Amino acid sequence: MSLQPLTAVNCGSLVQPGFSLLDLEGDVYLFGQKGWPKRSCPTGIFGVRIKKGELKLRAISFSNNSSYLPPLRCPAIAHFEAQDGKPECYLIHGGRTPNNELSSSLYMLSVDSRGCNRKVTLRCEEKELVGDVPSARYGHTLSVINSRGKTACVLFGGRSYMPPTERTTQNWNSVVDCPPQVYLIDLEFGCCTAHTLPELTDGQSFHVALARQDCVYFLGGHILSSDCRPSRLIRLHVELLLGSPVLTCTILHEGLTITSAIASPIGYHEYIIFGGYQSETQKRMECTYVGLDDVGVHMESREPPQWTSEISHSRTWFGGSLGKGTALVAIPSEGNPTPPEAYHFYQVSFQ
DNA sequence: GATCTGGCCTGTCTTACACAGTGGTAGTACTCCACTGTCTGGCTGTACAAAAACCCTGCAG
Ligand SMILES: [Ca+2]
Numbered sequence: 409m410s411l412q413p414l415t416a417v418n419c420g421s422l423v424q425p426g427f428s429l430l431d432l433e434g435d436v437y438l439f440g441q442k443g444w445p446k447r448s449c450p451t452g453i454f455g456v457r458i459k460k461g462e463l464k465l466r467a468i469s470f471s472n473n474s475s476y477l478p479p480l481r482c483p484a485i486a487h488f489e490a491q492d493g494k495p496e497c498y499l500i501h502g503g504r505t506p507n508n509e510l511s512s513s514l515y516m517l518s519v520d521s522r523g524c525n526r527k528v529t530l531r532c533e534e535k536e537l538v539g540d541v542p543s544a545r546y547g548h549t550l551s552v553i554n555s556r557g558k559t560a561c562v563l564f565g566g567r568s569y570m571p572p573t574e575r576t577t578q579n580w581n582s583v584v585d586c587p588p589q590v591y592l593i594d595l596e597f598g599c600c601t602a603h604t605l606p607e608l609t610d611g612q613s614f615h616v617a618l619a620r621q622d623c624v625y626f627l628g629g630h631i632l633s634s635d636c637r638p639s640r641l642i643r644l645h646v647e648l649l650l651g652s653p654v655l656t657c658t659i660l661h662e663g664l665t666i667t668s669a670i671a672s673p674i675g676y677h678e679y680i681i682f683g684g685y686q687s688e689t690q691k692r693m694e695c696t697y698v699g700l701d702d703v704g705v706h707m708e709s710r711e712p713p714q715w716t717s718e719i720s721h722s723r724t725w726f727g728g729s730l731g732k733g734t735a736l737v738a739i740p741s742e743g744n745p746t747p748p749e750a751y752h753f754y755q756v757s758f759q
Numbered sequence: 760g761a762t763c764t765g766g767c768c769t770g771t772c773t774t775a776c777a778c779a780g781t782g783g784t785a786g787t788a789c790t791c792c793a794c795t796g797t798c799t800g801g802c803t804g805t806a807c808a809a810a811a812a813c814c815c816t817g818c819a820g
Contacts, residue, residue: 441771466765467766525764526765527764
């Protein structure tokens with residue numbers, strides 16, 4: 409629980425406030441970049457390295473038989489555990505296009521090989537969605553669950569632009585909470601199913617969810633319709649029966665008022681929720697620790713690593729999970745004139 | 760310790776971005792001075808005729 413100011417040696421204008429961090433098979437891969445893929449790296453995905461505070465960003469590449477992806481803005485992420493038939497998978501859907509727009513498409517990502525010089529080759533595959541597909545949305549959450557004993561995907565949350573009939577020029581950029589009906593997805597086949605929940609009467613965004621032993625727990629839960637940040641955690645439990653995937657839900661009395669959190673898994677289930685915003689302008693300073701058992705969530709705090717007055721006074725911030733007690737956060741920087749490297753970086757560590 | 764190779768640096772070539780706006784100066788194409796004498800067409804006192812659109816009336820249905 410201590411921070412360290414970094415400096416990106418170069419390439420300090422390709423990161424945008426919304427983006428994703430995926431640690432898979434060693435190195436960390438950043439997804440989502442300001443502007444369309446520059447011809448430096450038509451991949452649109454960067455390898456990251458942290459050497460003596462220096463932030464180094466390398467170019468990556470996919471296969472020939474791989475699909476090429478638009479750099480989604482703030483998609484949903486799922487770390488599908490390494491198993492048959494294809495270990496290990498990263499399921500993404502569906503973010504916002506840098507050409508400002510949504511894609512209800514769903515991508516599956518894996519690693520291919522190495523090096524031959526420690527270089528990393530990747531592979532992307534779209535999936536047609538037999539559904540009952542959820543329309544395009546963003547800020548939602550996708551998760552993986554393993555129920556008796558097969559693997560399925562749970563999709564819930566997020567908002568979207570106006571319904572297409574109500575798409576109004578002067579209400580175009582506005583966005584309303586997508587209706588609260590969860591979606592169950594088999595990775596194969598891409599048969600998507602919709603399901604209703606009589607207790608989840610409202611959509612929500614940016615609520616970091618967690619999955620464990622085919623049981624899902626939603627923390628956070630900021631909502632537009634009521635301007636509320638209901639701390640109350642939401643648990644649900646699914647049993648994958650053929651062909652009725654039975655589903656149940658339940659309210660928890662207490663969770664936490666977190667919005668767009670950064671989740672670092674340190675142990676197999678020792679998680680720390682790092683930061684976000686506790687109120688509409690009041691960012692969350694403190695850290696929080698959650699132990700995740702079949703008993704459930706178990707809550708505690710840690711010491712908040714002292715934020716230098718720069719970040720502690722900065723209006724907004726964000727970051728991602730470098731993983732394993734380590735995470736990255738960024739600060740919108742000022743200047744006269746702008747450097748224009750307007751983002752400082754704090755590498756934060758647990759223990 | 761020899762070898763190799765992706766990734767990085769230098770140098771390269773290409774597409775953008777401020778330079779308007781303000782005053783003094785000059786050539787130059789377009790317009791009233793005075794002097795003129797003349798003509799048309801509005802003005803004016805009533806009386807005379809000609810159109811116009813209705814309102815009554817009368818015959819007709
Ligand atoms: Ca210009």
